[PDB]
Amino acid sequence: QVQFKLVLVGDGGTGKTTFVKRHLTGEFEKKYVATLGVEVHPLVFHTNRGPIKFNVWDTAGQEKFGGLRDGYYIQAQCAIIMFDVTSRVTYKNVPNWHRDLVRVCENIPIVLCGNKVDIKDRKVKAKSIVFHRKKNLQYYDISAKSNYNFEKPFLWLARKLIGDPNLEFVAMPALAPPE
């Protein structure tokens, strides 16, 4: 079994749980139910090199969970930092998310994601997203609503942790169903 620990961080309301759920079942949860501490969810992908699993640590974004998530971060091999392209405060808080990650695990591959690009008018324009440039992180515009780039964070991280930059997601083998 080949797997990785992934901590998912970002302000409350950014779409972390929604993103995880979308991968997990296909659903798009309209409601906002704040995550209580952390939810650990397995996500399996298939590739030209075999099955891989991300053990995703879906952490709550509220400040009060600051002390606990330092414990969540121990042994994390990668992370996604989520922000909301609809809420300027959430891009403004990104540097603190990065700082919080790097002070517990130094040189781990990290993706910055600007969720919610489906909404017609961004409050955070493309040209204001620059943090990934100063910290040499991988960036993606994403949307848990429209699936836009929604596989990318996992592929890119998969490529880095596995050590194969040409790694490709392949079709999940279709086992024979019930009867």
Partner 1 sequence: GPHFEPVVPLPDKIEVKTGEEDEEEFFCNRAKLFRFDVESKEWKERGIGNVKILRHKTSGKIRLLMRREQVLKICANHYISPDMKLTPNAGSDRSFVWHALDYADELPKPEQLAIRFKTPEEAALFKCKFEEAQSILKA
Ligand X SMILES: Nc1nc2c(ncn2[C@@H]2O[C@H](COP(=O)(O)OP(=O)(O)O)[C@@H](O)[C@H]2O)c(=O)[nH]1
Binding site: what residues are annotated? Answer: 11-18, 29-35, 61, 115-118, 143-145
The answer to whether 153 and 43 are in contact (CB under 8 A) is no
Q: Which helix (H) or strand (E) segment is 71 a member of?
A: helix 66-72
Asked if 108 is part of the footprint of partner 1 (rule: CB under 8 A), the reply reads yes
- Per the annotation, binding residues for GTP are 11-18, 29-35, 61, 115-118, 143-145
Amino acid present at 178: P
Q: How far is 163 from 61, CA to CA, in rounded Å?
A: 30
Q: 35 vs 138, which CB is nearer to ligand BEF?
A: 35
Question: What is the longest distance spanned by two Cα atoms in the chain?
Answer: 56
Q: Which residue has the tokens 């298939």?
A: 46
Which of 37-68 are b and which e, b meaning 16 or more Cβ less than 10 Å from the residue's Cβ? ebbebebebebeeeebebebbbbbbeeebeee
Q: Which distant-in-sequence residues (6+ apart) come within 8 Å of 68 by Cβ?
A: 37, 38
Residues in 41-80 at the binding interface with partner 1, rule: CB under 8 A: 45-46, 48-50, 77
Asked if 109 is part of the footprint of ligand X (rule: CB under 6 A), the reply reads no
CB of 157 to ligand BEF, least distance (A): 20
x/- binding map, residues 33-62, to ligand BEF, per CB under 6 A?
-xx------------------------xx-
Give the one residue of 104, 109, 119, 123 binding partner 1; rule: CB under 8 A: 109
Q: How far is 113 from 141, CA to CA, in rounded Å?
A: 6
Asked if 35 is part of the footprint of ligand X (rule: CB under 6 A), the reply reads yes
Q: 41 vs 145, which CB is nearer to ligand X?
A: 145
Residues in 128-147 at the binding interface with ligand X, rule: CB under 6 A: 143-145
Which residues of the shown chain bind ligand X in the complex (CB under 6 A)? 10, 12-18, 29-35, 61, 115-116, 118-119, 143-145
